[PDB]
Amino acid sequence: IVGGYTCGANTVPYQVSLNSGYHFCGGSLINSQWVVSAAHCYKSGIQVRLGEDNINVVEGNEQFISASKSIVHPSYNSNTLNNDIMLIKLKSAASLNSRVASISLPTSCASAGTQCLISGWGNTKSSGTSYPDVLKCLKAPILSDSSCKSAYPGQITSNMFCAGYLEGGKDSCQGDSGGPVVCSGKLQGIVSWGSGCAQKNKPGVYTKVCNYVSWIKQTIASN
Ligand SMILES: CN1CCC[C@@H](O/N=C/c2ccc(C(=N)N)cc2)C1
Ligand SMILES: [Ca+2]
């Protein structure tokens, strides 16, 4: 996260870190056994880390649970990033309390102008590279589809939306991938892609989660 703020320990209780020896992606806990992330975060040997603040220090509220299976969206295209969404099942159910909690799926799509909270342990610099140890947060509005398409000609599908600031300086970044965009207590987006980070006229592009609620529910129901 570039241009954001320190969230505060366990203030984002649905935020997970995906770990394969090191943090490599965020995700969102949607029930005791399932995490939603980006398909571009797919890899084998994922351990899900819940209750994290400092990802380099054991602080007392962590749950580390290995993934038993990953399900990349059937229509994911890694070249265009269309359908950039993946489900991860935990080997055992997480213990849910105030610091580790699921986030609700949306029942309808959000609108341009809605304020959302974007979070993760990604790069904090728009030019260089600095990775934080504690969770960073950014409040950002959903942008109109027209301005999103204008920023990224020929690249924005019906399964994507832009959020952030066309002036630059405030954005998600590398390492935030797969993490949440939460708007009025609903998971509306997943950190997907962008040109660099926090660049002028290049806002963050997010997977449009409301399009996938049917698929998520039916997948969970049978797996
Ligand atoms: C570190 N890796 C490995 C995975 C592939 C790629 O992930 N990049 C994600 C990204 C980039 C930019 C933005 C943004 N500006 N909002 C948001 C997300 C680079
Ligand atoms: Ca920790």
Question: Are residues 3 and 21 both part of a single domain?
Answer: no
* SS percent in the chain: helix, strand, coil, step 5: 10, 35, 55
Question: Are residues 65 and 141 both part of a single domain?
Answer: no
Cβ-contact 173, 122 below 8 angstroms? yes
Residue nearest to atom 3 of ligand 1 (CA): 174
Residues forming the annotated binding site for substrate?
A: 171-172, 174-175, 177
Resolution in A: 1.8
Q: Tell me if residue 84 is catalytic.
A: yes
Tokens coding 30: 């949607």
C-alpha–C-alpha distance, residues 40 and 150, integer Å: 24
Helices (H), the chain: 145-151, 213-221
Which ligand lies nearest the alpha carbon of 118? 1
The technique by which this structure was obtained is X-ray
Question: Are residues 91 and 162 both part of a single domain?
Answer: no
For residue 202, give the ligand 1 atom closest to its CA: 15
Q: Tell me if residue 17 is catalytic.
A: no
| Spatial CA neighbour of 94 closest among 52, 133, 151, 39 | 52
Question: Are residues 98 and 31 both part of a single domain?
Answer: yes
Which one-letter amino acid corresponds to residue 76?
A: Y
Cβ-contact 20, 47 below 8 angstroms? yes
For residue 176, give the ligand 1 atom closest to its CA: 18
C-alpha–C-alpha distance, residues 158 and 202, integer Å: 18
Residues forming the annotated binding site?
A: 52, 54, 57, 62, 171-172, 174-175, 177
**How many residues are listed for the chain in this entry?**
223
Question: Are residues 139 and 155 both part of a single domain?
Answer: yes
| Spatial CA neighbour of 186 closest among 213, 204, 168, 205 | 213
Question: Are residues 190 and 119 both part of a single domain?
Answer: yes
Tokens coding 61: 């509220």
C-alpha–C-alpha distance, residues 164 and 161, integer Å: 10
Residue nearest to atom 19 of ligand 1 (CA): 174
Dihedral sign (CA 178, 194, 107, 104): positive
* CATH code for position 49: 2.40.10.10
Question: Are residues 183 and 217 both part of a single domain?
Answer: no
Residue nearest to atom 2 of ligand 1 (CA): 174
Domain count, the chain: 2
Of 17, 40, 70, 73, which one is the catalytic site residue?
A: 40
Q: Tell me if residue 32 is catalytic.
A: no
How many contiguous H segments (helices) and E segments (strands) does the chain have?
2, 13
Q: Which domain holds residue 171?
A: 1-12+103-210
Question: Are residues 73 and 83 both part of a single domain?
Answer: yes
| Interval between CA 193 and ligand 1 midpoint (Å) | 5
Which one-letter amino acid corresponds to residue 135?
A: L
Question: Are residues 54 and 137 both part of a single domain?
Answer: no
Residue nearest to atom 18 of ligand 1 (CA): 193
C-alpha–C-alpha distance, residues 75 and 11, integer Å: 34
C-alpha–C-alpha distance, residues 142 and 214, integer Å: 22
Which one-letter amino acid corresponds to residue 189?
A: G
Question: Are residues 167 and 74 both part of a single domain?
Answer: no
Question: Are residues 97 and 121 both part of a single domain?
Answer: no
With a Cβ cut-off of 6 Å, ligand 1 is lined by 40, 171-177, 191, 193-194, 197, 204
Cβ-contact 15, 120 below 8 angstroms? yes
Question: Are residues 62 and 169 both part of a single domain?
Answer: no
C-alpha–C-alpha distance, residues 145 and 199, integer Å: 18
Residue of 76, 126, 193, 195 best suited for mutating to test ligand 1, as the one with most atoms within 8 Å of CB: 193
Cβ-contact 125, 3 below 8 angstroms? no
Partnered with residue 187 across adjacent β-strands are 182
Which ligand lies nearest the alpha carbon of 135? 2
